[PDB]
Amino acid sequence: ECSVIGYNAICINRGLHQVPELPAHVNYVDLSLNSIAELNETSFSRLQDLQFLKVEQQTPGLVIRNNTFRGLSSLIILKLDYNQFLQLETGAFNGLANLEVLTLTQCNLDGAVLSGNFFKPLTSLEMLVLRDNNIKKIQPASFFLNMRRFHVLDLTFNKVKSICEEDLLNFQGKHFTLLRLSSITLQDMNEYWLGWEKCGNPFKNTSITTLDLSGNGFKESMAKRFFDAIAGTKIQSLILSNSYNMGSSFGHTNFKDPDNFTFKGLEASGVKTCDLSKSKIFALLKSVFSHFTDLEQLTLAQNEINKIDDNAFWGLTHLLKLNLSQNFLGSIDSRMFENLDKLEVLDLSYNHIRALGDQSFLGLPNLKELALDTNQLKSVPDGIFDRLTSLQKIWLHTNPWDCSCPRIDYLSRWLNKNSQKEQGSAKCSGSGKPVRSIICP
Amino acid sequence: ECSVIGYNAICINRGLHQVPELPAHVNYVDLSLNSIAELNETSFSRLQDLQFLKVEQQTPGLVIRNNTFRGLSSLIILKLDYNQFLQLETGAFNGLANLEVLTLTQCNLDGAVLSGNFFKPLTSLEMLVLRDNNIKKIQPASFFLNMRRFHVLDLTFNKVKSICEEDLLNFQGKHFTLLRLSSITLQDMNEYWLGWEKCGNPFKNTSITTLDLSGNGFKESMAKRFFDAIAGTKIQSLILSNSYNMGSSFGHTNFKDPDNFTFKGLEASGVKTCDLSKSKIFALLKSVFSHFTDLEQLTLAQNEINKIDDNAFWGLTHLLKLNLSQNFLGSIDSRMFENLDKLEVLDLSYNHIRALGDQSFLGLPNLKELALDTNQLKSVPDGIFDRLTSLQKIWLHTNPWDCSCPRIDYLSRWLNKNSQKEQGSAKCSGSGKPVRSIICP
Amino acid sequence: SRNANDGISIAQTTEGALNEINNNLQRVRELSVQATNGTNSDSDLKSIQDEIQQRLEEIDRVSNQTQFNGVKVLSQDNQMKIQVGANDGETITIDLQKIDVKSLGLDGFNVNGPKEATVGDLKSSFKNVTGYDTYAAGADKYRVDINSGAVVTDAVAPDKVYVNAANGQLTTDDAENNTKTKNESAKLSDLEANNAVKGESKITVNGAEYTANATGDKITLAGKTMFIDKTASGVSTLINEDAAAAKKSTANPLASIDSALSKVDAVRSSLGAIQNRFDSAITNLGNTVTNLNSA
Amino acid sequence: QASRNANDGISIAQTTEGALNEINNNLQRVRELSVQATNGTNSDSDLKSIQDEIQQRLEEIDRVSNQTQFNGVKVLSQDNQMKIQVGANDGETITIDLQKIDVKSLGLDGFNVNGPKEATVGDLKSSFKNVTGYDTYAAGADKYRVDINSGAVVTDAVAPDKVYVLTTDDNESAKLSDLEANNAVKGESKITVNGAEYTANATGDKITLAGKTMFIDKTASGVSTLINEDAAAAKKSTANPLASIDSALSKVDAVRSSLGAIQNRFDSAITNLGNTVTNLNSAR
Ligand SMILES: *[C@@H]1O[C@H](CO)[C@@H](O[C@@H]2O[C@H](CO)[C@@H](O)[C@H](O)[C@H]2NC(C)=O)[C@H](O)[C@H]1NC(C)=O
Ligand SMILES: *[C@@H]1O[C@H](CO)[C@@H](O[C@@H]2O[C@H](CO)[C@@H](O)[C@H](O)[C@H]2NC(C)=O)[C@H](O)[C@H]1NC(C)=O
Ligand SMILES: *[C@@H]1O[C@H](CO)[C@@H](O[C@@H]2O[C@H](CO)[C@@H](O)[C@H](O)[C@H]2NC(C)=O)[C@H](O)[C@H]1NC(C)=O
Ligand SMILES: *[C@@H]1O[C@H](CO)[C@@H](O[C@@H]2O[C@H](CO)[C@@H](O)[C@H](O)[C@H]2NC(C)=O)[C@H](O)[C@H]1NC(C)=O
Ligand SMILES: *[C@@H]1O[C@H](CO)[C@@H](O)[C@H](O)[C@H]1NC(C)=O
Ligand SMILES: *[C@@H]1O[C@H](CO)[C@@H](O)[C@H](O)[C@H]1NC(C)=O
Ligand SMILES: *[C@@H]1O[C@H](CO)[C@@H](O)[C@H](O)[C@H]1NC(C)=O
């Protein structure tokens, strides 16, 4: 039944009720979409060289007995996703000392899968994907301390009311390259919770390259307390996109925009990249980013930003890249980008910018790339770009440029003189021909 | 000294202290920017065929004596503007029975100029321009009832606290083609005024082609009471641009947007054209235009419109033209333009439109011209323009079109099939080439 | 693999729109938690409700606009069969569901309805509030005026109440005989000392007598619960329980949103399983291997 | 460069005219906001909302003043007399009279409508709970107190005695109508607010604490508090708000008028060079 080509046995959707006889040299087996009701020790007897095994989405109810994968010491990746009501016996992963990657997405697993001994045999485990299960409380068993190569955990879509110090005790001492806690909600961890003190620091003595906390709401008062609680945690790259509770949003003042205290807990984290896009932020308040003293990249794209207060960027001494694309900016002036002395890249595309102030880019001498495309600019002030002597690339297209002389004189000469900087080509509204081609008498 | 060419004597700025000897056949004389201190009967003795006379902006203090223009029975236009502290004797315009147009802009005239007999001789007067004087109260003298050809009056820039029934008694019976009461403020005529009852109807038994009330604030409560006061007045064309008090504006709720009562007084006015641009309107509330049953053209350009409530245009059965250009619309759906069945022209350019609903133009079968340029559209839904079979002109340019296939297929095919309709040329963002030129496989 | 690819696009389109809806529901939920647990003025509840209304409307707009190739993926319960196999047996069915405000149980969902009147809330949102509390010391019934705190008998023609100079007992006697020392005016503490039991209050508000319970938390006019309502402008008015029910704040607002949430989540899970199905059917046709690194 | 400079003279004048109009509209809106603040029924929260809009309009004025330019020249930034040469032969200069017009120069720095106001007794009882105390009166040597709220008349003594109808002798109870019948002279009031006795002049006009004039500070969220003149100084709401805006308005209007006269001057200078006739129809 299976298609065996080279080292690969594709046994997808073949009406199998058991593991078939396969050539014993295969190193890759896909047994997805069959009706295997139960795996046990006899299932994979033949297949020693096996490195990659997928047994995804069997008919609901798959049972994996003790010692099913015993003797599969070459197995590196095991995918058991979408097995609805997966039943694992506690020694189900015996023999898997060499396994690096285990995925169990949407298998109706609860927190006992972490607190029990199911993963005790997986001493070489690197990567564990437990998305979209019924894990309500993250409580790794003590053997996790001895898993020296464990560095990726994906818990996306589990409904986790809270994560606390005592929950994550057995992750202390770990460095995670990726800890993905996205759309878990953390519903309990709000400002009216009586649990904050007892919760302590869930990431005590833990460090993280990428901490993905996207899709969790992060109301300002939650973000402040959560970052107060994990203060000191080394995080290189912070992802808080779709913090749908964070901004006040345009038109309402029920929730607060983040302010100069919101991210104080990240003072000592060493954050290099921060993603705050799609979070309904409407105003950048003074000093809101002041604790991000190592920050090099900041995206605030696709928020609702209409207002940037003076000193909104105070403290961002290392900031190289600022993305404000897809926001609601109506105009720019010099105060908006004060304190961004090292900035190299500014994306202001897809706003509603109708005017640039005389000295809009004054405090951006190192700007290399400036994106002003897709706004609503009829004109720029004379000399606007003169101080930008490190500029390499500018975007100006998809704006209704008014090519009247002399209004257009400075920009057309500027674009003509700097033609290799222009990305795309700004057009006159009306005639539709290049701004750079206009010559004013 | 003067330049005489043809029938025209140009005697501008020649250091003249009197009216010079001129050839007696000239029919046009310009004596502006001289130092003529005084005009009397001997000034224009020579010049019978004279039709057009300008004596603007002499050195301050010009005196016009009794019978200055007597014998000038062919004079049609007399321009005396910018004579600071103009002194007219009361028979200054004797002999001007044939004069059609008199202009006295910025001459420091007070209301005595209208209530005295200065204009009594001007039996053929059509047009009187009294801009930018110190007329505080508009009180035409009784002889105005006998001026059968008088139909234009411009009072722009006079600080007029109020206009009331008794002020304008002597314009009753008159039809004005143009009554320009622009930037007069009408400061007293607010919602806290104790004067409304006594004020009555300033336009009693008067009808108007163009009533220009631009630049007067017209807070919603003032508009309501003013139009309640003048209820019944036939007005063909109503100009309320720069009613800087009318809208709530974007971001604030101190002032009210106009509502279903605001313009009730115009029920029976037969208004055909209404200009409400530059008035800080933020929301179009339900039935706000419902009393404008004869309305043919409506401009709401350069407001702050971000929200159009259901049935905002209810009652506009005759509306042919709607201008919503330079506003803050973020999207369009079918409910926005219900009740506009006769609409032929819709201008939505220069908004911030990021999305068109599936059926945005459903209730607009008769549309001939559609302007969507200068917005922020990446795409349109399939079939969006299909029911627009009367369409002659469409503007789509200066939008960030996404030329991905197949997202772009419908619009590119539509544009290619309907290319004579497209005004300007929609471009792909990215490549910058015409949308019409994309062919999807 | 063409139809299986379309199956994926439909599933991605629906998943994206469900996520938008989920985020709006979760924001509504947090707004509601704020309305319930925050200290919230009348004006705050209205602001919150204005935002909730706008989010509910964003849900209906997503529901109404979201489409892939004609198909309005959230508009109707629709079982889409996608043929995944050349030989005509392999169909995979996408289970599409009507998801909009009405179907999620959220029509009329609100958080700014009228609240049951309380004694505290009366004396916090009205003026000229008169009346008294009743105490009972066994057989004897007493009235304690509010604002003055004066202790009177609970009768038609009420007697002033004083405190016995020797015993501490409650009495109507001005003084006590000797062998006259004045008795001090009685106070609440004197009723408390004397073991009196708090009964019902009689609270007059804008000239209308209301009966409050001992604890002061339930107010009734002729045996019907009273709710305080506030106008847009902010004038407090007292209404009955039946004229209240129409404009009521939604009972169990959290449970209503969670219901909506789990309904949205169930379609989301289903879509995830169905995309894994499509992914496998494509890899089965191409005979494609994922690589260890790419994994 | 004869009609060339005159044309530039026109452009400068139009650029300034347009900017002045933007500024005039903002001032007139600020004026109407201020009229609403004064004559409307306005909660503490309303006055704050009004002021937030006023601040934004004042800020729009400074922006216009700072950005408006024609060919390098910031037409509203500095008092500057621009000579435009309008005649070939070098004598014809027409001078544009440009003026510094911004929030500071219009006298509107700190213009506000929500700041603390001098405290009145009316305003004390209208914004504080448990406002207690009495007015004093005097019919010659005899001295009286009248409790606000209750209207009871007592003797102005250390340990005060009830007054009756004027006698302290046990005769109906004394009230203010009996005092004015005795031609009594209203003296200073003594008013306790949140447990602090303040003193008020006869008319309720001024309120003092140890000689210091008291102001009522108002927050958006309804709570008010009392503060002294010195602490109110920098933030107190603007005296004569209408007069302040009207002052700004007529300053802006005077530049506008002048510009109108200077544009007419330029128009004539151009027609004088071209030898241009306007036509009867074109005049209509
Ligand atoms: C967990 O805690 C330990 C002990 O405090 C950390 O190890 C120390 O780290 C410092 C640098 O900050 C070194 O100078 C010491 O030499 C280390 N101690 C020991 C005993 O080696 C450790 O790095 C922490 N782990 C994480 C992941 O944060
Ligand atoms: C600023 O952020 C925007 C929005 O996130 C970026 O655009 C996205 O970039 C990714 C990765 O290249 C694309 O797959 C998406 O399609 C883009 N989304 C949209 C809505 O365009 C943008 O590139 C960022 N700007 C800069 C300069 O990096
Ligand atoms: C002003 O008043 C008169 C009299 O009321 C108007 O004249 C009447 O107009 C109606 C048409 O509506 C005729 O049927 C009557 O015969 C007219 N009466 C007379 C005596 O002529 C007149 O037209 C009004 N003028 C304006 C400008 O409204
Ligand atoms: C809608 O109104 C806009 C704004 O008034 C019109 O654009 C103006 O048209 C006038 C008169 O032709 C021009 O002199 C202005 O320069 C235009 N202003 C701007 C800001 O572009 C527009 O033409 C109207 N739309 C339609 C379809 O008539
Ligand atoms: C292994 O699986 C098969 C099911 O096909 C079953 O018959 C057998 O009893 C199982 N063996 C053990 C040891 O559980
Ligand atoms: C499987 O393995 C564990 C560990 O030895 C053992 O204790 C457990 O009872 C076994 N379960 C079954 C069902 O055989
Ligand atoms: C000008 O004319 C009128 C009418 O004859 C006369 O009464 C008036 O006073 C005259 N003015 C002078 C200055 O003579």
PDB file of N, CA, C and O in Angstrom, chain A residues 352-386:
ATOM      1  N   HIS A 352      -1.896  58.652   7.529  1.00  0.00           N
ATOM      2  CA  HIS A 352      -2.749  59.593   6.874  1.00  0.00           C
ATOM      3  C   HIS A 352      -2.080  60.969   6.858  1.00  0.00           C
ATOM      4  O   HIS A 352      -2.715  61.989   7.065  1.00  0.00           O
ATOM      5  N   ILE A 353      -0.779  60.983   6.592  1.00  0.00           N
ATOM      6  CA  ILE A 353       0.029  62.180   6.809  1.00  0.00           C
ATOM      7  C   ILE A 353      -0.292  63.215   5.752  1.00  0.00           C
ATOM      8  O   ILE A 353      -0.202  62.958   4.548  1.00  0.00           O
ATOM      9  N   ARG A 354      -0.726  64.376   6.212  1.00  0.00           N
ATOM     10  CA  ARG A 354      -1.126  65.416   5.306  1.00  0.00           C
ATOM     11  C   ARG A 354      -0.128  66.535   5.303  1.00  0.00           C
ATOM     12  O   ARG A 354      -0.152  67.366   4.408  1.00  0.00           O
ATOM     13  N   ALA A 355       0.747  66.564   6.309  1.00  0.00           N
ATOM     14  CA  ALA A 355       1.719  67.639   6.407  1.00  0.00           C
ATOM     15  C   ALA A 355       2.960  67.174   7.147  1.00  0.00           C
ATOM     16  O   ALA A 355       2.855  66.455   8.145  1.00  0.00           O
ATOM     17  N   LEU A 356       4.120  67.602   6.658  1.00  0.00           N
ATOM     18  CA  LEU A 356       5.385  67.448   7.381  1.00  0.00           C
ATOM     19  C   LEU A 356       5.838  68.801   7.894  1.00  0.00           C
ATOM     20  O   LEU A 356       5.827  69.782   7.163  1.00  0.00           O
ATOM     21  N   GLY A 357       6.225  68.852   9.161  1.00  0.00           N
ATOM     22  CA  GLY A 357       6.716  70.083   9.732  1.00  0.00           C
ATOM     23  C   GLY A 357       8.061  70.421   9.126  1.00  0.00           C
ATOM     24  O   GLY A 357       8.837  69.537   8.721  1.00  0.00           O
ATOM     25  N   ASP A 358       8.301  71.712   9.012  1.00  0.00           N
ATOM     26  CA  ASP A 358       9.605  72.279   8.692  1.00  0.00           C
ATOM     27  C   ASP A 358      10.847  71.470   9.075  1.00  0.00           C
ATOM     28  O   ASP A 358      11.840  71.467   8.332  1.00  0.00           O
ATOM     29  N   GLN A 359      10.843  70.868  10.264  1.00  0.00           N
ATOM     30  CA  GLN A 359      12.080  70.295  10.777  1.00  0.00           C
ATOM     31  C   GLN A 359      11.841  68.908  11.303  1.00  0.00           C
ATOM     32  O   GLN A 359      12.473  68.486  12.270  1.00  0.00           O
ATOM     33  N   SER A 360      10.945  68.206  10.612  1.00  0.00           N
ATOM     34  CA  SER A 360      10.431  66.920  11.022  1.00  0.00           C
ATOM     35  C   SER A 360      11.492  65.914  11.403  1.00  0.00           C
ATOM     36  O   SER A 360      11.292  65.146  12.346  1.00  0.00           O
ATOM     37  N   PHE A 361      12.598  65.901  10.659  1.00  0.00           N
ATOM     38  CA  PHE A 361      13.600  64.860  10.831  1.00  0.00           C
ATOM     39  C   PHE A 361      14.892  65.390  11.484  1.00  0.00           C
ATOM     40  O   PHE A 361      15.951  64.746  11.441  1.00  0.00           O
ATOM     41  N   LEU A 362      14.776  66.565  12.103  1.00  0.00           N
ATOM     42  CA  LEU A 362      15.894  67.229  12.765  1.00  0.00           C
ATOM     43  C   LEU A 362      16.720  66.289  13.641  1.00  0.00           C
ATOM     44  O   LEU A 362      17.926  66.202  13.500  1.00  0.00           O
ATOM     45  N   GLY A 363      16.066  65.572  14.545  1.00  0.00           N
ATOM     46  CA  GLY A 363      16.826  64.691  15.424  1.00  0.00           C
ATOM     47  C   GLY A 363      17.027  63.274  14.885  1.00  0.00           C
ATOM     48  O   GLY A 363      16.947  62.299  15.661  1.00  0.00           O
ATOM     49  N   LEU A 364      17.271  63.166  13.565  1.00  0.00           N
ATOM     50  CA  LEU A 364      17.560  61.876  12.932  1.00  0.00           C
ATOM     51  C   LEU A 364      18.755  61.883  11.980  1.00  0.00           C
ATOM     52  O   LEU A 364      18.648  61.408  10.865  1.00  0.00           O
ATOM     53  N   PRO A 365      19.907  62.399  12.423  1.00  0.00           N
ATOM     54  CA  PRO A 365      21.013  62.598  11.470  1.00  0.00           C
ATOM     55  C   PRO A 365      21.516  61.315  10.831  1.00  0.00           C
ATOM     56  O   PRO A 365      22.014  61.348   9.708  1.00  0.00           O
ATOM     57  N   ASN A 366      21.406  60.194  11.533  1.00  0.00           N
ATOM     58  CA  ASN A 366      21.890  58.936  10.966  1.00  0.00           C
ATOM     59  C   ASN A 366      20.887  58.171  10.128  1.00  0.00           C
ATOM     60  O   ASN A 366      21.143  57.016   9.742  1.00  0.00           O
ATOM     61  N   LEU A 367      19.745  58.794   9.856  1.00  0.00           N
ATOM     62  CA  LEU A 367      18.735  58.111   9.074  1.00  0.00           C
ATOM     63  C   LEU A 367      19.324  57.675   7.753  1.00  0.00           C
ATOM     64  O   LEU A 367      19.871  58.487   6.998  1.00  0.00           O
ATOM     65  N   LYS A 368      19.166  56.396   7.490  1.00  0.00           N
ATOM     66  CA  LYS A 368      19.524  55.854   6.194  1.00  0.00           C
ATOM     67  C   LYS A 368      18.329  55.602   5.276  1.00  0.00           C
ATOM     68  O   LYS A 368      18.455  55.692   4.044  1.00  0.00           O
ATOM     69  N   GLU A 369      17.184  55.267   5.863  1.00  0.00           N
ATOM     70  CA  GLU A 369      16.025  54.870   5.102  1.00  0.00           C
ATOM     71  C   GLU A 369      14.769  55.570   5.653  1.00  0.00           C
ATOM     72  O   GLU A 369      14.481  55.520   6.847  1.00  0.00           O
ATOM     73  N   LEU A 370      14.034  56.222   4.769  1.00  0.00           N
ATOM     74  CA  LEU A 370      12.876  56.958   5.166  1.00  0.00           C
ATOM     75  C   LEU A 370      11.676  56.595   4.293  1.00  0.00           C
ATOM     76  O   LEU A 370      11.688  56.834   3.093  1.00  0.00           O
ATOM     77  N   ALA A 371      10.625  56.063   4.894  1.00  0.00           N
ATOM     78  CA  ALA A 371       9.471  55.678   4.088  1.00  0.00           C
ATOM     79  C   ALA A 371       8.266  56.546   4.388  1.00  0.00           C
ATOM     80  O   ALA A 371       7.725  56.494   5.488  1.00  0.00           O
ATOM     81  N   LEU A 372       7.875  57.332   3.381  1.00  0.00           N
ATOM     82  CA  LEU A 372       6.772  58.274   3.476  1.00  0.00           C
ATOM     83  C   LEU A 372       5.730  57.963   2.409  1.00  0.00           C
ATOM     84  O   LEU A 372       4.832  58.745   2.159  1.00  0.00           O
ATOM     85  N   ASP A 373       5.862  56.811   1.761  1.00  0.00           N
ATOM     86  CA  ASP A 373       4.938  56.460   0.702  1.00  0.00           C
ATOM     87  C   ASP A 373       3.549  56.205   1.291  1.00  0.00           C
ATOM     88  O   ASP A 373       3.380  55.954   2.513  1.00  0.00           O
ATOM     89  N   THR A 374       2.558  56.281   0.418  1.00  0.00           N
ATOM     90  CA  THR A 374       1.217  55.882   0.761  1.00  0.00           C
ATOM     91  C   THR A 374       0.768  56.712   1.953  1.00  0.00           C
ATOM     92  O   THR A 374       0.405  56.211   3.001  1.00  0.00           O
ATOM     93  N   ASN A 375       0.799  58.011   1.770  1.00  0.00           N
ATOM     94  CA  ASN A 375       0.246  58.893   2.759  1.00  0.00           C
ATOM     95  C   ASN A 375      -0.651  59.852   1.990  1.00  0.00           C
ATOM     96  O   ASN A 375      -1.236  59.445   1.014  1.00  0.00           O
ATOM     97  N   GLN A 376      -0.771  61.107   2.404  1.00  0.00           N
ATOM     98  CA  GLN A 376      -1.601  62.025   1.656  1.00  0.00           C
ATOM     99  C   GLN A 376      -0.907  63.372   1.539  1.00  0.00           C
ATOM    100  O   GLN A 376      -1.485  64.420   1.775  1.00  0.00           O
ATOM    101  N   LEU A 377       0.340  63.342   1.117  1.00  0.00           N
ATOM    102  CA  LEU A 377       1.117  64.561   1.084  1.00  0.00           C
ATOM    103  C   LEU A 377       0.975  65.271  -0.230  1.00  0.00           C
ATOM    104  O   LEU A 377       1.164  64.680  -1.282  1.00  0.00           O
ATOM    105  N   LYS A 378       0.637  66.554  -0.163  1.00  0.00           N
ATOM    106  CA  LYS A 378       0.575  67.333  -1.358  1.00  0.00           C
ATOM    107  C   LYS A 378       1.904  67.960  -1.585  1.00  0.00           C
ATOM    108  O   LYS A 378       2.273  68.207  -2.722  1.00  0.00           O
ATOM    109  N   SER A 379       2.639  68.204  -0.501  1.00  0.00           N
ATOM    110  CA  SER A 379       3.910  68.916  -0.582  1.00  0.00           C
ATOM    111  C   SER A 379       4.756  68.680   0.641  1.00  0.00           C
ATOM    112  O   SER A 379       4.262  68.233   1.677  1.00  0.00           O
ATOM    113  N   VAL A 380       6.031  69.027   0.533  1.00  0.00           N
ATOM    114  CA  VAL A 380       6.931  69.072   1.691  1.00  0.00           C
ATOM    115  C   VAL A 380       7.478  70.489   1.858  1.00  0.00           C
ATOM    116  O   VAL A 380       7.530  71.245   0.886  1.00  0.00           O
ATOM    117  N   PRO A 381       7.903  70.853   3.082  1.00  0.00           N
ATOM    118  CA  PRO A 381       8.567  72.165   3.228  1.00  0.00           C
ATOM    119  C   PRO A 381       9.942  72.206   2.536  1.00  0.00           C
ATOM    120  O   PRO A 381      10.648  71.205   2.504  1.00  0.00           O
ATOM    121  N   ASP A 382      10.310  73.348   1.974  1.00  0.00           N
ATOM    122  CA  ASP A 382      11.684  73.529   1.458  1.00  0.00           C
ATOM    123  C   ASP A 382      12.749  73.113   2.483  1.00  0.00           C
ATOM    124  O   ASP A 382      12.654  73.427   3.696  1.00  0.00           O
ATOM    125  N   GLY A 383      13.749  72.383   1.990  1.00  0.00           N
ATOM    126  CA  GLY A 383      14.876  71.979   2.815  1.00  0.00           C
ATOM    127  C   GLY A 383      14.633  70.826   3.750  1.00  0.00           C
ATOM    128  O   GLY A 383      15.520  70.499   4.508  1.00  0.00           O
ATOM    129  N   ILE A 384      13.457  70.179   3.676  1.00  0.00           N
ATOM    130  CA  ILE A 384      13.063  69.184   4.674  1.00  0.00           C
ATOM    131  C   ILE A 384      14.101  68.045   4.831  1.00  0.00           C
ATOM    132  O   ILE A 384      14.335  67.558   5.933  1.00  0.00           O
ATOM    133  N   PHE A 385      14.693  67.629   3.714  1.00  0.00           N
ATOM    134  CA  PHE A 385      15.579  66.463   3.661  1.00  0.00           C
ATOM    135  C   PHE A 385      17.066  66.823   3.681  1.00  0.00           C
ATOM    136  O   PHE A 385      17.899  65.922   3.690  1.00  0.00           O
ATOM    137  N   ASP A 386      17.384  68.121   3.678  1.00  0.00           N
ATOM    138  CA  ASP A 386      18.791  68.644   3.619  1.00  0.00           C
ATOM    139  C   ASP A 386      19.765  68.170   4.704  1.00  0.00           C
ATOM    140  O   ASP A 386      20.945  67.905   4.417  1.00  0.00           O
TER     141      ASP A 386
END
